């Protein structure tokens, strides 16, 4: 709690400087309420005042999402140029003010903030719905512990360093504990190699096991970062358009077409799998110039354990075929990685040797008493994942990766 009150008292004395420095630059104006006027001032949190003040300072948007208004976000507040060299520096302060406002409203001032769900013993209890999405993915609520800022966003490490497992001093020796975090690698991208291995005879599920996939994909597609390559590959895979994967590099629809052709002509089995799904589910789709009228044949899909997975739209069928089969292997893995630990001779809970703390969509965070217990957990997670991969006869080879640390900033 102290390490987040220090953060709140730090960056609550920054948005009270980014408005003082900014209202003297962007002045006030009379706005019509005999003509009744009022003296309204510049509010940077609004996306109308910035739109007006950039409209009357010499900027043309050339991007019209709304029918009479432009779009204003972080990707057009970078590519904006004005004549006055003061406003060119003021726009960066506007973006920093919006970031600080979102940080404050998430951390400490919201209705569902972190400091309004801390119990007497210094712990946060958040509800986790195991089946909240239509594809078997768990949802997190009151508060959401799967939505805190990562280590790549600004003020991210200072927000994840408070959510540690070394803040629990032991009740019998007065010592802090150790945290182990285990993440699966290439989960839905390896489920794809499971599902299409009957088409290309299994010569795609061998390159995934031969070295890292996203690093060599970044090498092959000359993306700047591994995170951008990882965003791009699933953006291409889950049915994008001509522009929404050219926007990842910022280029035009020419590059947005040639990247689709380059990653479609490598393995010509994704289109065959998509045609198989279309021939299995849908039978006829009448076209309307503003809508779509479809006569269905099977609205549901059998999952990995017979569950009728519901399909919302016929172009998200590959999505609800991949992620609904990817969530269930993690859901069995989190069960088996304690069914082996209890049978190994340990004790679950705070008065034992280990305790689960949070389960976000891919990785698990467990906190344990000694480093040898951490090593036992980080060993048996692999055996649990391999038993999951053997129980359902996957054509791939599943594998994870674990880290050890004091808090959830090294164990990300």
């Amino acid at each position: 709690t102290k390490a987040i009150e220090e953060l709140y008292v730090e960056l609550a004395a920054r948005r009270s400087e980014l408005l003082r420095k900014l209202t003297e630059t962007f002045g006030s104006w009379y706005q019509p309420k005999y003509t009744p006027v009022e003296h309204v001032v510049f509010n940077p949190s609004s996306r109308d005042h910035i739109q007006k003040k950039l409209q009357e300072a010499g900027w043309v948007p050339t991007k019209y999402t709304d029918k009479g208004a432009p779009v204003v976000d972080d990707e057009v507040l970078e590519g904006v140029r004005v004549d006055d060299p003061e406003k060119q520096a003021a726009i960066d302060l506007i973006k920093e003010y919006l970031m600080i406002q979102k940080r404050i409203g998430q951390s400490a001032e919201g209705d569902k903030a972190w400091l309004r769900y801390v119990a007497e013993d210094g712990k946060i209890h958040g509800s986790v719905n195991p089946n909240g999405a239509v594809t078997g993915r768990a949802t997190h609520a009151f508060p959401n512990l799967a939505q805190i800022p990562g280590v790549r966003s600004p003020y991210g490490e200072q927000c994840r360093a408070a959510f540690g497992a070394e803040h629990h001093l032991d009740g019998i020796t007065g010592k802090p504990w150790v945290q182990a975090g285990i993440d699966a690698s290439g989960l839905e991208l390896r489920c794809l190699a499971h599902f299409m291995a009957r088409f290309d005879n299994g010569e795609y599920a061998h390159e995934i096991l031969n070295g890292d996939i996203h690093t060599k994909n970044q090498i092959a597609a000359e993306l700047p970062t591994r995170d951008n390559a990882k965003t791009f590959i699933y953006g291409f895979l889950y049915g994008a358009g001509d522009e929404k994967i050219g926007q990842i590099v910022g280029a035009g629809k020419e590059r947005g077409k040639e990247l689709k052709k380059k990653f479609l002509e490598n393995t010509p089995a994704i289109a065959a799998l998509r045609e198989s799904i279309q021939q299995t589910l849908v039978e006829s789709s009448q076209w309307v110039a503003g809508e779509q009228q479809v006569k269905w044949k099977r609205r549901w899909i059998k999952g990995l354990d017979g569950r009728k997975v519901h399909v919302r739209s016929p172009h998200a069928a590959l999505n609800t075929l991949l992620q609904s089969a990817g969530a269930l292997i993690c859901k069995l893995w989190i069960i088996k990685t304690e069914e082996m630990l209890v049978e190994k001779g340990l004790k679950h809970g705070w008065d034992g040797d280990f305790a689960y703390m949070a389960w976000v969509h891919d990785e698990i965070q467990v906190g344990c008493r000694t480093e040898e217990i951490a090593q036992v957990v980080i060993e048996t997670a692999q055996e649990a994942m391999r038993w999951v991969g053997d129980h359902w006869n996957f054509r791939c080879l599943l594998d994870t990766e674990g880290k050890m640390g004091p808090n959830w900033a090294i164990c990300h």
């Binding site: 009150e5 709140y8 008292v9 609550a12 004395a13 009270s16 003082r20 003296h39 001032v41 404050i104 001032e109 209705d111």
Partner: protein
């Protein structure tokens, strides 16, 4: 509270409109929201406009939530602040202007607070004394943490805070921001923080607003009263260590070997028989403190007036006897040599005089604080004590010791002796004891140094005095200090060479 999304109708969106449990909807795209005087000023009558304050810094939503609205009645600008109750109804108002002409309308109770109608449960509370600091703390914390404020000033702290006792009892930590005090609140719960400016607004308008928010979340505990521990004195014990030098007595060096002079906060009692030369020794000590060390000296002679002691000082510095010679007074008034003696003494205005029991201490306090004197000399305390005289002289000595303490001023006091019971007289050569002081027995308990003079006017040598230290609370050495011989021609009592 947020429930789910409905499709909006004005903008035609799909998942823009959000429904709530209170019955109202809100769209995030089209931004459309759905659903004295003893006279309370009506909002539709007084032309109520929620304008903002530019020169101090207050947003519009803060004035809409707190109820601090500008009226445009009578062609002028009034600032009406509203007080409410726990049910949320208008009880009283305050109409404030540029001339601060307060017009408190309605039923203004003794326990009214500003901002108690929105905030009833929580953990921490910040209490201020005005309204502008309350709005400043709400601007810093974005109107979401419990802040209340008083309604009768900082002088009704024993009445307003005491009447509201079950209201403040619901909160866990009560933080005060009055002045940079009341104990009626329950103990172990009250925190008081310190800011480098007068209030919170002078910290907000000058860049110290961060130091506001650091004093809210980490406010220190309440020390109850002026008692201190033995660790917070650590610098001041150093500071008094680097201050404390004794003012040396002249005429004899035997005193300074066993008295160490005079220090700050030091009442020194001087006595002898009836007419044995107290005023001569005190006047010589006054001259040697005035013209030789640069200390500003304030006399308060009550026996004689200003002109006598002025002429005696002028005659005494020039090694002569001024008033005891008509020929010298007739001489120095003709040739104009008097200003040569006046300017060499009173050039750097070190001397201040008094022209003759509660107004006298006020005049001494004005002489100490306003003018800046360092050594105050009184004389002949028997007039000031002229009901029961023991109680008067005890209260007088207590007030003089209280004035000398915590100021750092040397205070020289002259007293006499009573009639002896048997034996011979004090003026004929009787050795004086410590319990010979008249008026009470309180003069020897509050005096930090007692000096007595003895001489024999009808003996063989009527100009050889004996100095006797009766009490010394600093060193503890008493007895005969030395011998001094009085001059019949120059008025200078000087260190002699006789041994008894």
């Amino acid at each position: 509270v947020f429930l789910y999304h409905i499709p909006c109708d004005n903008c035609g969106s799909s998942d823009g409109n959000s429904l709530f449990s209170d019955g109202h909807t809100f769209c995030y795209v089209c931004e459309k929201w759905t659903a004295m005087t003893y006279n309370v000023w009506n909002f539709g009558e007084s032309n109520g406009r929620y304008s903002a304050l530019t020169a101090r810094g207050i947003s519009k939503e803060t004035c809409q939530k707190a109820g601090y609205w500008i009226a445009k009645v009578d062609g002028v600008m009034y600032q009406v602040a509203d007080y409410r109750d726990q049910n949320g109804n208008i009880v009283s108002q305050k109409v404030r202007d540029k001339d601060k002409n307060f017009k408190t309308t309605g039923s203004h109770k003794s326990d009214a607070l500003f901002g108690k109608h929105l905030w009833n449960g929580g953990k921490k509370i910040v209490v201020t004394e005005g309204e502008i600091d309350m709005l400043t703390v709400m601007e810093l914390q974005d109107c979401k943490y419990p802040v209340v404020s008083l309604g009768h000033g900082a002088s009704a702290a024993k009445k307003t805070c005491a009447a509201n006792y079950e209201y403040f009892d619901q909160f866990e930590q009560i933080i005060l921001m009055f002045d940079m005090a009341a104990q009626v609140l329950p103990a172990g719960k009250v925190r008081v923080a310190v800011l480098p400016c007068k209030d919170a607004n002078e910290c907000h308008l000058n860049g110290h607003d961060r130091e506001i928010m650091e004093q809210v979340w980490n406010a220190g505990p309440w020390i109850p009263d002026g008692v201190v521990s033995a660790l917070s004195l650590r610098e001041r014990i150093r500071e008094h260590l680097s201050s404390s030098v004794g003012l040396l007595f002249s005429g004899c060096t035997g005193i300074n070997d066993k008295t160490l002079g005079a220090r700050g906060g030091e009442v020194i009692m001087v006595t002898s028989g009836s007419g044995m030369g107290k005023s001569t020794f005190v006047r010589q000590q006054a001259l040697q403190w005035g013209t030789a060390m640069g200390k500003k000296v304030g006399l308060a002679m009550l026996q004689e007036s200003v002109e006598e002691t002025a002429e005696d000082l002028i005659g005494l510095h020039n090694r002569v006897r001024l008033r005891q010679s008509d020929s010298l007074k007739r001489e120095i008034i003709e040739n104009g040599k008097f200003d040569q003696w006046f300017d060499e003494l009173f050039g750097n205005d070190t001397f201040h005089l008094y022209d003759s029991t509660d107004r006298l201490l006020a005049k001494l306090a004005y002489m100490r604080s306003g003018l800046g004197c360092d050594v105050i000399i009184l004389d002949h305390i028997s007039i000031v004590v002229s009901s029961d005289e023991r109680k008067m002289i005890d209260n007088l000595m207590t007030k003089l010791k209280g004035f000398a303490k915590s100021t750092g001023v040397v205070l020289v006091v002259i007293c006499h002796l009573k009639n002896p019971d048997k034996g011979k007289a004090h003026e004929e050569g009787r050795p004086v004891s410590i319990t010979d002081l008249r008026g009470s027995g309180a003069l020897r308990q509050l005096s930090d140094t007692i000096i007595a003079l003895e001489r024999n006017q009808q003996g063989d040598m009527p100009n050889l005095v004996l100095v006797r230290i009766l009490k010394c609370r600093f060193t503890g050495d008493t007895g005969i200090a030395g011998y001094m011989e009085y001059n019949k021609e120059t008025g200078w009592l000087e260190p002699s060479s006789y041994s008894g």
